[PDB]
Write an enzyme that holds these catalytic residues in place. Structure first.
Site, short mmCIF file in Angstrom:
data_model
loop_
_atom_site.label_atom_id
_atom_site.label_comp_id
_atom_site.label_asym_id
_atom_site.label_seq_id
_atom_site.Cartn_x
_atom_site.Cartn_y
_atom_site.Cartn_z
N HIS A 192 -5.58 17.02 -13.39
CA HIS A 192 -6.47 16.62 -12.28
C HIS A 192 -7.36 15.45 -12.69
N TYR B 257 -8.99 10.93 -11.48
CA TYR B 257 -10.40 10.44 -11.38
C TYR B 257 -10.63 9.35 -12.44
N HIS C 118 0.90 11.23 -0.01
CA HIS C 118 -0.54 11.36 -0.40
C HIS C 118 -0.86 10.42 -1.55
N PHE C 119 -0.20 10.57 -2.69
CA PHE C 119 -0.75 9.89 -3.90
C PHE C 119 -0.40 8.40 -3.92
N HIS C 120 0.59 7.91 -3.16
CA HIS C 120 0.80 6.45 -3.11
C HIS C 120 -0.37 5.78 -2.37
N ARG D 244 10.43 16.56 -2.96
CA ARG D 244 10.14 15.44 -3.86
C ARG D 244 11.11 15.51 -5.04
N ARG D 245 11.11 14.48 -5.88
CA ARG D 245 11.86 14.43 -7.16
C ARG D 245 13.35 14.65 -6.95
C1 HAS Z 1 -6.03 8.02 -7.78
C2 HAS Z 1 -5.24 9.03 -7.56
C3 HAS Z 1 -5.63 10.22 -6.77
C4 HAS Z 1 -6.86 10.49 -6.03
C5 HAS Z 1 -8.17 9.74 -5.84
C6 HAS Z 1 -6.55 11.81 -5.45
C7 HAS Z 1 -7.53 12.55 -4.62
C8 HAS Z 1 -7.49 13.95 -4.19
N1 HAS Z 1 -6.43 14.71 -4.40
FE1 HAS Z 1 -4.55 14.17 -5.20
N2 HAS Z 1 -3.86 16.13 -5.04
C9 HAS Z 1 -4.57 17.17 -4.62
C10 HAS Z 1 -5.92 17.07 -4.11
C11 HAS Z 1 -6.79 15.90 -4.01
C12 HAS Z 1 -8.15 15.98 -3.46
C13 HAS Z 1 -8.87 17.16 -2.93
C14 HAS Z 1 -8.64 14.63 -3.59
C15 HAS Z 1 -9.96 14.13 -3.20
O1 HAS Z 1 -10.61 13.61 -4.33
C16 HAS Z 1 -9.78 13.08 -2.10
C17 HAS Z 1 -11.20 12.77 -1.52
C18 HAS Z 1 -11.22 11.49 -0.73
C19 HAS Z 1 -11.87 11.28 0.45
C20 HAS Z 1 -12.61 12.38 1.18
C21 HAS Z 1 -11.74 9.94 1.14
C22 HAS Z 1 -13.05 9.18 1.41
C23 HAS Z 1 -12.67 7.83 2.00
C24 HAS Z 1 -13.06 6.63 1.53
C25 HAS Z 1 -14.00 6.38 0.35
C26 HAS Z 1 -12.59 5.38 2.28
C27 HAS Z 1 -13.68 4.79 3.17
C28 HAS Z 1 -13.29 3.45 3.78
C29 HAS Z 1 -14.10 2.37 3.89
C30 HAS Z 1 -15.48 2.36 3.40
C31 HAS Z 1 -13.58 1.05 4.50
C32 HAS Z 1 -14.39 0.56 5.67
C33 HAS Z 1 -14.14 -0.92 5.84
C34 HAS Z 1 -13.88 -1.51 6.99
C35 HAS Z 1 -13.68 -2.98 7.01
C36 HAS Z 1 -13.75 -0.72 8.28
C37 HAS Z 1 -3.84 18.43 -4.73
C38 HAS Z 1 -4.24 19.82 -4.43
O2 HAS Z 1 -5.40 20.06 -4.31
C39 HAS Z 1 -2.56 18.10 -5.21
C40 HAS Z 1 -1.48 19.07 -5.50
C41 HAS Z 1 -0.58 19.27 -4.30
C42 HAS Z 1 0.76 19.87 -4.71
O3 HAS Z 1 1.17 20.83 -4.01
O4 HAS Z 1 1.37 19.41 -5.72
C43 HAS Z 1 -2.67 16.64 -5.39
C44 HAS Z 1 -1.63 15.81 -5.98
C45 HAS Z 1 -1.75 14.49 -6.53
C46 HAS Z 1 -0.70 13.91 -7.36
C47 HAS Z 1 0.59 14.49 -7.76
C48 HAS Z 1 0.59 15.15 -9.11
C49 HAS Z 1 2.05 15.53 -9.37
O5 HAS Z 1 2.84 14.62 -9.77
O6 HAS Z 1 2.41 16.72 -9.16
C50 HAS Z 1 -1.24 12.62 -7.72
C51 HAS Z 1 -0.62 11.58 -8.60
C52 HAS Z 1 -2.58 12.62 -7.03
C53 HAS Z 1 -3.47 11.48 -7.08
C54 HAS Z 1 -4.79 11.37 -6.54
N3 HAS Z 1 -5.33 12.30 -5.76
N4 HAS Z 1 -2.82 13.70 -6.30
C1 HEM Z 2 6.77 -1.00 -5.16
C2 HEM Z 2 5.94 -0.03 -5.21
C3 HEM Z 2 6.39 1.38 -5.08
C4 HEM Z 2 7.33 2.05 -4.35
C5 HEM Z 2 8.24 1.53 -3.25
C6 HEM Z 2 7.24 3.43 -4.80
C7 HEM Z 2 8.06 4.47 -4.31
C8 HEM Z 2 8.08 5.73 -4.85
C9 HEM Z 2 8.81 6.80 -4.29
C10 HEM Z 2 9.68 6.81 -3.05
C11 HEM Z 2 8.57 7.90 -5.06
C12 HEM Z 2 9.14 9.30 -4.81
C13 HEM Z 2 10.36 9.61 -5.61
C14 HEM Z 2 10.77 11.06 -5.74
O1 HEM Z 2 9.98 11.99 -5.51
O2 HEM Z 2 11.97 11.27 -6.15
C15 HEM Z 2 7.68 7.51 -6.12
C16 HEM Z 2 7.20 8.38 -7.09
C17 HEM Z 2 6.06 8.05 -7.82
N1 HEM Z 2 5.37 6.89 -7.80
FE1 HEM Z 2 5.78 5.27 -6.82
N2 HEM Z 2 6.31 3.55 -5.74
C18 HEM Z 2 5.76 2.37 -5.97
C19 HEM Z 2 4.72 2.01 -6.80
C20 HEM Z 2 3.93 2.91 -7.54
C21 HEM Z 2 2.70 2.64 -8.22
C22 HEM Z 2 2.00 1.29 -8.29
C23 HEM Z 2 2.30 3.82 -8.77
C24 HEM Z 2 1.13 4.17 -9.62
C25 HEM Z 2 0.21 3.34 -10.01
C26 HEM Z 2 3.29 4.81 -8.46
C27 HEM Z 2 3.25 6.15 -8.93
C28 HEM Z 2 4.31 7.05 -8.64
C29 HEM Z 2 4.36 8.39 -9.26
C30 HEM Z 2 3.31 8.99 -10.25
C31 HEM Z 2 5.48 9.01 -8.77
C32 HEM Z 2 5.96 10.39 -9.04
C33 HEM Z 2 6.85 10.61 -10.24
C34 HEM Z 2 7.32 12.02 -10.44
O3 HEM Z 2 7.36 12.84 -9.48
O4 HEM Z 2 7.73 12.43 -11.57
N3 HEM Z 2 4.24 4.23 -7.68
N4 HEM Z 2 7.33 6.17 -5.94
CU CU Z 3 -5.48 17.36 -8.80
#
Ligand code: HAS
Ligand code: HEM
Ligand code: CU
Ligand code: OLC
Ligand code: OLC
Ligand code: OLC
Ligand code: OLC
Ligand code: OLC
Ligand code: OLC
Ligand code: OLC
Ligand code: OLC
Ligand code: OLC
Ligand code: OLC
Ligand code: OLC
Ligand code: OLC
Ligand code: OLC
Ligand code: CUA
Lengths: 31, 554, 167
Positions: free
Chosen positions: B225, B229, B376-378, B441-442
């Protein structure tokens, strides 16, 4: 008042609610 | 160069950044082929003619996850969260330790890369036992990650030298963010270091016969997790302390920024059972406790949404914009350093909503291990973190190299960030929608073309995203090397100060900032939360170890 | 002044947003706690550690004969011993009656697999040396696909099974 910042957190709040209640509904439909 | 003799930290920062972007380019090559796969199009025969060391979809997916999500994100964080504080304090880091951290990262990467390229570690970036990788993968990955412990020491040193020469003064804002960041990462990293030293390394060298996969997963997700962050917080530091200046405004609150970073120090680590809702042998009581703490770790991002939106609105009004929406049009949409992080923040709205669903215990059974999760995570790491890093190049690269950005390179940068953003948004629709139709996935689904007929419409989105992102990636490669390999140099760009924002102060601020400057106290509290959240389960698991043999199924 | 007025107005509305934020997250916690007190909670895996030896599960005990895998344990309850392995499920098909409570006891002789039943909330990781126990009642008869949704090696994309729910 920060009316522009209020408009952003309204859109964020509605996005959270649609996601969360939509999947809550799905979970009961599959249960 | 006389500039590198006065600021050798510029040259070391540059080597981190360039090694990071090279990892991003190589890992990203696989992305468009994976997106086509989730569109039911098999382009792997073509890829294998171009890169004949690629044996399988799953080896490509391992390279993709390791290079993009572990290597690129770490090297970016080590560049930004050492250099920005050094420049804010106007103090030189320990350059012996800075170059050691770089050599450890470089050697760790080379050693892990060798078995990945040779098809000896096709276990994905989670490497869940009992799938058994080559020892060089686990050793290389361990050395790569331990590089960051040198970075922690470097920043705590800068902070202690500053404090000793400025008794009575509150930590400056950027240094405050870096200190609490690096101390959070210390606590976070222990799960994966324990998994590697106690289990994966002795297992892979043949010193122990088996590994308990439930204890291995539990230690993995302790780090697994907070590492996301770790990826995010360097982007937030730029968004809080540099973006408002690039927009034409100021940061509206120093204390609200410090408070977001403090809540991440307390809440990033004790939540990893939200990756284990579908695991046997973990009490449902503890899963509910991690679910509740996960919902609380959302608060600092909900706060960030308001503080940053208010800062951009302030900048837009300053620049003449009127009404509900006129502040938007008045912002500098011609500046890629402004545009890239702001598009990233827009995609982060649905990205964050999906995370809150994932966190909600029983709701995770709907989405766990489906295409939803990559959707979600992209939006989180592949959009906000990556676009913020791409935008940083327009002000950071001139500052490090003295090389100017031409008006042409500016315009090309705008096209890259818009196509990358739009490609990630289209893929998000395809993957979230396919996940709700139970597509896993995967999975090399293009090899079973009749298995998911229900997903025909979202599959068209995944094809369109694959093409758009392939174009964005090729334009990015051309632009980055146009800049790096250009002959022109203007050393006065290299001596210019960084574009740190001014802050608006209030009477409140002094009092809030003192309570938050007690970093020893808050570190204690963060440590104790990890003990209470993990300790009881880990006692249970370590008392009932059931190691099982290793398998190679590739 | 402008800046100082803006700063006071910004913090005032930010306090309101943070109270609203907390209120919303608390309502989600209450709606999650409600799911835990209904029949829909039976898909949460048992927290008990039930250790088995993956090297003998095909030779001795309740997974060794797939044709005797479905056992009546209650007046309207069946326990099914399911093996997830590289690359398939036994028994195949799994045959159970509509309207009864089914207790799935799943394990693996090799690597981690997923057990995801399309159209249901059954979605559980299967660890070698551990038993995953989940409960579900099928309301509708017909054929339900089992999908492996945890990467288990090169045969992963082809790893499917079948549940037949009989009227
Ligand atoms: C950088 C990468 C990541 C961030 C940040 C992230 C945030 C969250 N995630 Fe996540 N996630 C999960 C829960 C959360 C929760 C509660 C948050 C929170 O921290 C998110 C809070 C965010 C907000 C409440 C958004 C606030 C919005 C903002 C700040 C934008 C404001 C816009 C503005 C200001 C623009 C205005 C401008 C104008 C011009 C209009 C959970 C479960 O609870 C899973 C497991 C699910 C499963 O079944 O496998 C999960 C799975 C993943 C995985 C997959 C791991 C794997 O390979 O199995 C990755 C890589 C990942 C990345 C990230 N995740 N997450
Ligand atoms: C050209 C840009 C990208 C495309 C089109 C792309 C597309 C994909 C797709 C379709 C998957 C799902 C594959 C599967 O579940 O079999 C995947 C997995 C993933 N991508 Fe990307 N992706 C891109 C860039 C990135 C970048 C910039 C990051 C992180 C900085 C990223 C992190 C990941 C991760 C962590 C996984 C999961 C690997 C795993 O399940 O073992 N990707 N991507
Ligand atoms: Cu997490
Ligand atoms: C922007 C890029 C990201 C794009 C994300 C797209 C996904 C959107 C929302 C998911 C919400 C769930 C939708 C399910 C609706 C179901 C519903 O409302 O319930 C009816 C029925 O009762 C059920 O079985
Ligand atoms: C095995 C390791 C090779 C040891 C590498 C020895 C080279 C260290 C020199 C050094 O300080 O490298 C930093 C940078 O390259 C200066 O421009
Ligand atoms: C080796 C890496 C060093 C990591 C040290 C982190 C723990 C530490 O020293 O913190 C104590 C506290 O911050 C006192 O001010
Ligand atoms: C840079 C990081 C590399 C770390 C190396 C630790 C190596 C671990 C070695 C631990 C000894 C294992 C051992 O002695 O195993 C015998 C055991 O009793 C059998 O049951
Ligand atoms: C630099 C240090 C390298 C460590 C060298 C360690 C060399 C150990 C080679 C033997 C080995 O790992 O064999 C695999 C094992 O027998 C089956 O899992
Ligand atoms: C603030 C820190 C958090 C403290 C409050 C969290 C709630 C604690 C316990 C509820 C767990 C109840 C678990 C019941 C699940 C049983 C079940 O449904 O079995 C299948
Ligand atoms: C499907 C994917 C949807 C794509 C959404 C993009 C909208 C982005 C909103 C921000 C755009 C603002 C641009 C703007 O106002 O530009 C001013 C103009 O350049 C001179 O005044
Ligand atoms: C009808 C839908 C069909 C599918 C969409 C096709 C995909 C991409 C179109 C190309 C978009 C490129 C946009 C670039 C915008 C840009 O650079 O705007 C500069 C401005 O100053 C603001 O920053
Ligand atoms: C846009 C995505 C919307 C697609 C929503 C699909 C919902 C679904 O799968 O239906 C729910 C349940 O499975 C049947 O009762
Ligand atoms: C703009 C581009 C695409 C919009 C979406 C195109 C979606 C139209 C359906 C495409 C498709 O593949 O058709 C589904 C089905 O198989 C038919 O019989
Ligand atoms: C514009 C959309 C570009 C994407 C078009 C290709 C989509 C695709 O693969 O469609 C297969 C076809 O529907 C099989 O009958
Ligand atoms: C269905 C749901 C619809 C979407 C829900 C709306 C979003 C929630 C909160 C907005 C923030 C509310 C902030 C109100 C606080 C008012 C305040 O404190 O302002 C006093 C100030 O002193 C005067 O200048
Ligand atoms: C200022 C006002 C303060 C008070 C405002 C607080 C809002 C309350 C929200 C939700 C109630 C939760 C009750 C849980 C009921 C769930 C019912 C349900 O979803 O049941 C359908 C399902 O089919 C069954 O099998
Ligand atoms: Cu079994 Cu994937």
């Amino acid at each position: 008042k920060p009316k522009g910042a209020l408009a952003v957190i309204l859109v964020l709040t509605l996005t959270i609610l649609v996601f969360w209640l939509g999947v809550y509904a799905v979970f009961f439909a599959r249960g | 160069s006389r500039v590198y003799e006065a600021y050798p930290e510029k040259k070391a920062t540059l080597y981190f950044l360039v090694l990071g972007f090279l990892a991003l380019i190589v890992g990203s090559l696989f992305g468009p082929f994976q997106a086509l796969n989730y569109g039911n199009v098999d382009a792997y025969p073509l890829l294998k003619r171009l890169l004949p060391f690629v044996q399988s979809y799953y080896q490509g997916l391992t390279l993709h996850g390791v290079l993009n999500a572990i290597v690129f994100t770490q090297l970016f964080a080590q560049a930004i969260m050492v250099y920005l504080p050094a420049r804010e304090l106007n103090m030189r880091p320990n350059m012996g330790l800075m170059w050691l951290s770089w050599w450890m990262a470089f050697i760790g990467l080379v050693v892990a890369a060798l078995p990945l390229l040779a098809n000896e570690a096709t276990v994905l970036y989670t490497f869940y036992p009992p799938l058994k990788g080559h020892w060089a993968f686990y050793l290389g990955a361990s050395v790569f990650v331990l590089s960051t412990w040198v970075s922690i020491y470097i920043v705590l040193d800068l902070w202690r030298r500053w404090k000793a020469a400025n008794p009575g003064k509150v930590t400056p804002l950027v240094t405050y963010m870096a200190v609490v960041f690096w101390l959070m990462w210390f606590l976070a990293s222990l799960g994966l270091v324990l998994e590697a030293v106690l289990f994966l390394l002795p297992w892979s060298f043949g010193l122990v016969e088996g590994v308990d996969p439930l204890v291995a997963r539990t230690l993995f997700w302790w780090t697994g997790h907070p590492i996301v962050y770790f990826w995010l917080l360097p982007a937030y530091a730029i968004i809080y302390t540099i973006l408002p200046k690039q927009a034409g405004g100021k940061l509206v609150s120093d204390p609200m920024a410090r408070l977001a970073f403090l809540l991440f120090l307390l809440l990033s680590t004790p939540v990893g059972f939200h990756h284990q809702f579908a695991d046997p042998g973990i009490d449902p009581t503890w899963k509910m406790i991690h679910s509740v703490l996960t919902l609380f770790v959302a608060v600092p991002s909900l706060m960030t949404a308001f503080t940053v939106a208010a800062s951009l609105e302030f900048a837009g009004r300053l620049r003449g914009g009127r009404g509900l929406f006129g502040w938007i049009r008045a912002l500098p949409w011609d500046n890629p350093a402004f545009v890239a992080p702001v598009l990233g923040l827009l995609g982060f709205i649905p990205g964050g909503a999906g995370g809150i669903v994932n966190a909600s215990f029983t709701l995770d059974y709907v989405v766990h291990n489906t295409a939803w999760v990559p959707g979600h995570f992209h939006l989180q790491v592949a959009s906000l973190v990556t676009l913020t890093a791409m935008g940083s190049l327009y002000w950071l690269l001139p500052n490090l190299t003295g090389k100017p950005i031409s008006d042409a390179q500016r315009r090309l940068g705008l096209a890259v960030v818009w196509l990358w953003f739009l490609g990630m948004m289209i893929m998000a629709v395809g993957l979230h929608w396919a996940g709700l139709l139970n597509v896993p996935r995967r999975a090399y689904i293009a090899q079973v073309p009749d298995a998911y007929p229900h997903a025909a419409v979202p599959m068209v989105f995944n094809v369109l995203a694959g093409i758009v992102l392939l174009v964005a990636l090729l334009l990015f490669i051309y632009g980055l090397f146009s800049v790096l390999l250009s002959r022109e140099r203007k050393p006065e760009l290299a001596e210019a100060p960084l574009p740190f924002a001014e802050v608006i102060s209030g009477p409140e601020d002094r009092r809030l900032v003192l309570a938050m400057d007690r970093i020893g106290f808050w570190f204690a509290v963060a440590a104790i939360l990890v003990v209470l959240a993990y300790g009881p389960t880990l006692v249970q698991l370590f008392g009932h170890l059931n190691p099982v043999p290793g398998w190679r199924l590739w | 002044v402008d800046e100082h007025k803006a700063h006071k107005a910004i913090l005032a509305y930010e306090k309101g947003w943070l109270a609203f934020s907390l209120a919303m997250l608390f309502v989600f916690i209450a709606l999650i706690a409600y799911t835990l007190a209904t029949h829909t909670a039976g898909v949460i895996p048992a927290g008990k550690l039930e250790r088995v030896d993956p090297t003998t599960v095909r030779q001795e005990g309740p997974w060794a004969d797939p044709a005797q895998a479905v056992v009546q344990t209650g007046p309207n309850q069946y326990t099914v011993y399911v093996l997830a392995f590289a690359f398939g499920y036994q028994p195949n098909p799994i045959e159970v009656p509509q309207g009864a409570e089914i207790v799935f006891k799943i394990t693996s002789p090799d690597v981690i697999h997923g057990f995801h039943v399309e159209g249901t909330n059954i979605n559980v990781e299967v660890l070698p040396g551990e038993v995953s126990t989940v409960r579900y009642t099928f309301k509708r008869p017909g054929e339900y696909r089992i999908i492996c949704n945890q990467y288990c090696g090169l045969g992963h994309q082809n790893m499917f099974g079948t549940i037949v729910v009989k009227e």
